[PDB]
Amino acid sequence: TQAVEAGEKTVEQFVQALNKGDYNKAAEMTSKKAANKSALSEKEILDKYQNIYGAADVKGLQISNLKVDKKDDSTYSFSYKAKMNTSLGELKDLSYKGTLDRNDGQTTINWQPNLVFPEMEGNDKVSLTTQEAARGNIIDRNGEPLATTGKLKQLGVVPSKLGDGGEKTANIKAIASSFDLTEDAINQAISQSWVQPDYFVPLKIIDGATPELPAGATIQEVDGRYYPLGEAAAQLIGYVGDITAEDIDKNPELSSNGKIGRSGLEMAFDKDLRGTTGGKLSITDADGVEKKVLIEHEVQNGKDIKLTIDAKAQKTAFDSLGGKAGSTVATTPKTGDLLALASSPSYDPNKMTNGISQEDYKAYEENPEQPFISRFATGYAPGATFKMITAAIGLDNGTIDPNEVLTINGLKWQKDSSWGSYQVTRVSDVSQVDLKTALIYSDNIYTAQETLKMGEKKFRTGLDKFIFGEDLDLPISMNPAQISNEDSFNSDILLADTGYGQGELLINPIQQAAMYSVFANNGTLVYPKLIADKETKDKKNVIGETAVQTIVPDLREVVQDVNGTAHSLSALGIPLAAKTGTAEIKEKQDVKGKENSFLFAFNPDNQGYMMVSMLENKEDDDSATKRASELLQYLNQNYQ
């Protein structure tokens, strides 16, 4: 029948309008208010859906098994299964039933309260009780807390309870001479544009015993997320913020009264950390007596997340950067455990998750050094450390003879006049350069020449055995490393520049620690790992074992040789293999070139730890090597 198909279309549009939250559009599809017709007027149906579905945060109403037949000459019965998402989960297996009316040339819904929820009759009410779930903690490899939930005491004043004249000036000075605060800051806070007489003005966060409360002052306990390392792990851990109405629209299972991860691991593991809201959604009678329970769950607190991070290493790595732009990554290269992921400069996550002013937040955004960047997950040109990879590749394909000596004159070199005014630059004017000398002095000209001899095809063959283009299995947002923009250099200059770690190479520090792990596993690349319980994954035969046993002794000389670039690290008296240097990088946003400092270091005796550190846009006479001794001591002492 052509009328049965039109009756289905009416039910389809009705469910759609309910799904899109347009309750007025769904109410206008109902018949007139009467017995055997619609139970309420259009405005009353609107307010019932907006109140009930709004109270439970109904979202994503969808139906199935729609059956529409005929019951009389103008009455058509319909039925369908349906499910929806609420603040307590998914309401599944709902049997909806009703009748349609065909008057004139339009079909409408004989609306009944059973179309809000299946077993609702007359003036039944809907009740929703919820219990908030406690956010899980984030802990280091030894159980030390990195992000914890706790209660905080908020000292505040009520301007109406403070006084009228004279008594107000006395109570302001009394509340100031008890909590250690200037009387001008209290008057500035209680006289802002938002403050009203009977409001509550949060003053100071008390972190101890509460003194006597003068007239007007009061304490308000509030739930507070706390970060013990503070800025030292702010980029990695992240921060949580107040949940907004827009967050609930995207995910109703969020607690509108709680916190949501805004960045870092708080956002990456937000679902595992937030838990699930417990409570009960029930239908009551006209007076509030419970009839049917729709949904009921117990509160499930969030599960803790245990990281491979070492809290003492994380703090030492971050402090060593001295507030300068840079990053540090420490690993146990044989297993991939990320011991430290430091990024500097940083922001205060405690100030961020509690009270942060518009001025201090803008100071973070307008800061040219950009403290919000997670530098350990930002792609950089690997710089001076990448010389080892090109060397290992050249040793495997037989291009590089370790004992063959190149004769290099001066500090600048170009292949031929086709390069124009461009030349590869080195820092030390050493005449007779072999592989060991090139690694000790960090000779870019030697590397550029050996890369050009090797050729693009052999160079890419060795590079393709690494992790370029791969998505690392890490809960950290990052782009995969790339060799260059396209699959071909189409440039001898770009090929040469790529050889010593520049050109269009983009590798973030974490991906660098993965690639450089081959020197601690005889050519096996061990993938980095951040979650403690995860299984170690690796990639075998990335470079030859011969290349490792040739390069690592040379990397010891980068430290031990009197002219090695990392010779200051020999003061430690510990077995070290390192590779350091400096590169001048010019990005699109930069006008002129800026200098970055690079460091790679690990223990060549036990392979217990590995470190990559970088300074971005460094000051003169500053370097990552000058700052690495303190972390290297800790890693060497506690990770053998």
Side-chain angles (χ1 to χ4, degrees), residues 4 26 58 66 69 110 117 174 185 232 334 486 502 590 610:
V4 174
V58 171
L66 179 58
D69 291 331
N110 296 327
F117 289 118
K334 291 191 298 181
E486 305 300 327
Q502 301 197 28
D590 306 329
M610 173 168 292

PDB file of all heavy atoms in Angstrom, residues 4 26 58 66 69 110 117 174 185 232 334 486 502 590 610:
ATOM      1  N   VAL A   4       1.021   2.750   3.589  1.00  0.00           N
ATOM      2  CA  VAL A   4       1.900   2.099   4.555  1.00  0.00           C
ATOM      3  C   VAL A   4       3.328   2.607   4.401  1.00  0.00           C
ATOM      4  O   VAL A   4       4.043   2.804   5.391  1.00  0.00           O
ATOM      5  CB  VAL A   4       1.817   0.570   4.402  1.00  0.00           C
ATOM      6  CG1 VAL A   4       2.842  -0.115   5.292  1.00  0.00           C
ATOM      7  CG2 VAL A   4       0.414   0.083   4.727  1.00  0.00           C
ATOM      8  N   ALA A  26       9.991  17.347  15.846  1.00  0.00           N
ATOM      9  CA  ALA A  26       9.362  16.050  16.072  1.00  0.00           C
ATOM     10  C   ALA A  26       7.960  16.200  16.647  1.00  0.00           C
ATOM     11  O   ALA A  26       7.079  15.385  16.351  1.00  0.00           O
ATOM     12  CB  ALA A  26      10.228  15.197  17.000  1.00  0.00           C
ATOM     13  N   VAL A  58      20.685  12.219  26.460  1.00  0.00           N
ATOM     14  CA  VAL A  58      20.426  11.253  25.402  1.00  0.00           C
ATOM     15  C   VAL A  58      21.087  11.714  24.110  1.00  0.00           C
ATOM     16  O   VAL A  58      21.021  12.896  23.740  1.00  0.00           O
ATOM     17  CB  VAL A  58      18.910  11.059  25.229  1.00  0.00           C
ATOM     18  CG1 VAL A  58      18.605  10.228  23.992  1.00  0.00           C
ATOM     19  CG2 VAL A  58      18.331  10.404  26.469  1.00  0.00           C
ATOM     20  N   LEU A  66      11.750  -1.982  11.934  1.00  0.00           N
ATOM     21  CA  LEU A  66      10.561  -1.143  11.859  1.00  0.00           C
ATOM     22  C   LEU A  66       9.433  -1.893  11.158  1.00  0.00           C
ATOM     23  O   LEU A  66       9.589  -2.337  10.015  1.00  0.00           O
ATOM     24  CB  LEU A  66      10.874   0.163  11.129  1.00  0.00           C
ATOM     25  CG  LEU A  66       9.697   1.125  10.956  1.00  0.00           C
ATOM     26  CD1 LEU A  66       9.096   1.491  12.305  1.00  0.00           C
ATOM     27  CD2 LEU A  66      10.127   2.372  10.201  1.00  0.00           C
ATOM     28  N   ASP A  69       1.975  -1.446   9.901  1.00  0.00           N
ATOM     29  CA  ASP A  69       0.847  -2.076   9.228  1.00  0.00           C
ATOM     30  C   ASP A  69      -0.404  -1.217   9.351  1.00  0.00           C
ATOM     31  O   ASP A  69      -0.312   0.012   9.433  1.00  0.00           O
ATOM     32  CB  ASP A  69       0.598  -3.476   9.795  1.00  0.00           C
ATOM     33  CG  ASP A  69       1.702  -4.452   9.440  1.00  0.00           C
ATOM     34  OD1 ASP A  69       2.339  -4.272   8.380  1.00  0.00           O
ATOM     35  OD2 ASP A  69       1.934  -5.401  10.218  1.00  0.00           O
ATOM     36  N   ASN A 110       0.263   9.466  16.703  1.00  0.00           N
ATOM     37  CA  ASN A 110      -0.541   9.587  17.911  1.00  0.00           C
ATOM     38  C   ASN A 110       0.385   9.513  19.116  1.00  0.00           C
ATOM     39  O   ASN A 110       0.633   8.428  19.653  1.00  0.00           O
ATOM     40  CB  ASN A 110      -1.612   8.497  17.972  1.00  0.00           C
ATOM     41  CG  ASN A 110      -2.616   8.607  16.843  1.00  0.00           C
ATOM     42  OD1 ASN A 110      -2.935   9.706  16.384  1.00  0.00           O
ATOM     43  ND2 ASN A 110      -3.118   7.465  16.385  1.00  0.00           N
ATOM     44  N   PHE A 117      10.131   6.813  26.703  1.00  0.00           N
ATOM     45  CA  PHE A 117      10.683   5.530  27.102  1.00  0.00           C
ATOM     46  C   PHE A 117       9.572   4.495  27.039  1.00  0.00           C
ATOM     47  O   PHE A 117       8.399   4.831  27.241  1.00  0.00           O
ATOM     48  CB  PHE A 117      11.294   5.585  28.510  1.00  0.00           C
ATOM     49  CG  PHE A 117      12.567   6.373  28.579  1.00  0.00           C
ATOM     50  CD1 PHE A 117      12.654   7.510  29.366  1.00  0.00           C
ATOM     51  CD2 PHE A 117      13.681   5.981  27.852  1.00  0.00           C
ATOM     52  CE1 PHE A 117      13.830   8.237  29.430  1.00  0.00           C
ATOM     53  CE2 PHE A 117      14.857   6.705  27.908  1.00  0.00           C
ATOM     54  CZ  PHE A 117      14.932   7.835  28.700  1.00  0.00           C
ATOM     55  N   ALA A 174      41.865  41.768  58.798  1.00  0.00           N
ATOM     56  CA  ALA A 174      41.933  40.588  59.653  1.00  0.00           C
ATOM     57  C   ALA A 174      42.131  39.319  58.832  1.00  0.00           C
ATOM     58  O   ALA A 174      42.931  38.452  59.202  1.00  0.00           O
ATOM     59  CB  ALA A 174      40.670  40.484  60.509  1.00  0.00           C
ATOM     60  N   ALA A 185      45.371  42.869  47.212  1.00  0.00           N
ATOM     61  CA  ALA A 185      44.960  41.773  46.340  1.00  0.00           C
ATOM     62  C   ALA A 185      43.554  41.291  46.671  1.00  0.00           C
ATOM     63  O   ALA A 185      42.819  40.867  45.771  1.00  0.00           O
ATOM     64  CB  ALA A 185      45.953  40.617  46.441  1.00  0.00           C
ATOM     65  N   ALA A 232      58.471  19.898  34.982  1.00  0.00           N
ATOM     66  CA  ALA A 232      59.461  18.940  34.503  1.00  0.00           C
ATOM     67  C   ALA A 232      58.849  17.835  33.652  1.00  0.00           C
ATOM     68  O   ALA A 232      59.568  17.202  32.872  1.00  0.00           O
ATOM     69  CB  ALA A 232      60.219  18.323  35.679  1.00  0.00           C
ATOM     70  N   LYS A 334      68.210  -1.661  25.117  1.00  0.00           N
ATOM     71  CA  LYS A 334      67.989  -3.079  24.864  1.00  0.00           C
ATOM     72  C   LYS A 334      66.527  -3.484  25.011  1.00  0.00           C
ATOM     73  O   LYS A 334      66.122  -4.504  24.441  1.00  0.00           O
ATOM     74  CB  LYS A 334      68.868  -3.925  25.791  1.00  0.00           C
ATOM     75  CG  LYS A 334      70.357  -3.826  25.478  1.00  0.00           C
ATOM     76  CD  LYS A 334      71.174  -4.863  26.237  1.00  0.00           C
ATOM     77  CE  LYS A 334      71.065  -4.675  27.741  1.00  0.00           C
ATOM     78  NZ  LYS A 334      71.891  -5.666  28.488  1.00  0.00           N
ATOM     79  N   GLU A 486      60.061  14.065  -0.968  1.00  0.00           N
ATOM     80  CA  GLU A 486      59.635  13.107  -1.975  1.00  0.00           C
ATOM     81  C   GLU A 486      60.502  11.855  -1.890  1.00  0.00           C
ATOM     82  O   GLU A 486      61.457  11.778  -1.111  1.00  0.00           O
ATOM     83  CB  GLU A 486      59.690  13.741  -3.367  1.00  0.00           C
ATOM     84  CG  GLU A 486      58.890  15.035  -3.492  1.00  0.00           C
ATOM     85  CD  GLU A 486      57.405  14.850  -3.198  1.00  0.00           C
ATOM     86  OE1 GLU A 486      56.864  13.761  -3.495  1.00  0.00           O
ATOM     87  OE2 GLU A 486      56.781  15.794  -2.663  1.00  0.00           O
ATOM     88  N   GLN A 502      71.185  16.785   7.771  1.00  0.00           N
ATOM     89  CA  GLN A 502      70.409  17.985   7.497  1.00  0.00           C
ATOM     90  C   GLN A 502      69.487  17.754   6.308  1.00  0.00           C
ATOM     91  O   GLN A 502      68.817  16.719   6.238  1.00  0.00           O
ATOM     92  CB  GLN A 502      71.340  19.175   7.270  1.00  0.00           C
ATOM     93  CG  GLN A 502      72.230  19.444   8.474  1.00  0.00           C
ATOM     94  CD  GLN A 502      72.842  20.822   8.461  1.00  0.00           C
ATOM     95  OE1 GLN A 502      72.280  21.759   7.900  1.00  0.00           O
ATOM     96  NE2 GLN A 502      74.009  20.952   9.077  1.00  0.00           N
ATOM     97  N   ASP A 590      61.893  31.154  10.096  1.00  0.00           N
ATOM     98  CA  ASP A 590      63.102  31.890  10.434  1.00  0.00           C
ATOM     99  C   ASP A 590      63.523  32.794   9.279  1.00  0.00           C
ATOM    100  O   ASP A 590      63.314  32.476   8.104  1.00  0.00           O
ATOM    101  CB  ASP A 590      64.239  30.925  10.785  1.00  0.00           C
ATOM    102  CG  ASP A 590      63.855  29.932  11.874  1.00  0.00           C
ATOM    103  OD1 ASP A 590      63.031  30.284  12.748  1.00  0.00           O
ATOM    104  OD2 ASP A 590      64.378  28.795  11.855  1.00  0.00           O
ATOM    105  N   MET A 610      70.769   4.845  27.149  1.00  0.00           N
ATOM    106  CA  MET A 610      71.040   5.607  25.939  1.00  0.00           C
ATOM    107  C   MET A 610      70.381   6.970  26.081  1.00  0.00           C
ATOM    108  O   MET A 610      69.313   7.086  26.685  1.00  0.00           O
ATOM    109  CB  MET A 610      70.523   4.879  24.691  1.00  0.00           C
ATOM    110  CG  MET A 610      70.624   5.683  23.410  1.00  0.00           C
ATOM    111  SD  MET A 610      70.325   4.698  21.931  1.00  0.00           S
ATOM    112  CE  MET A 610      71.769   3.634  21.936  1.00  0.00           C
TER     113      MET A 610
END
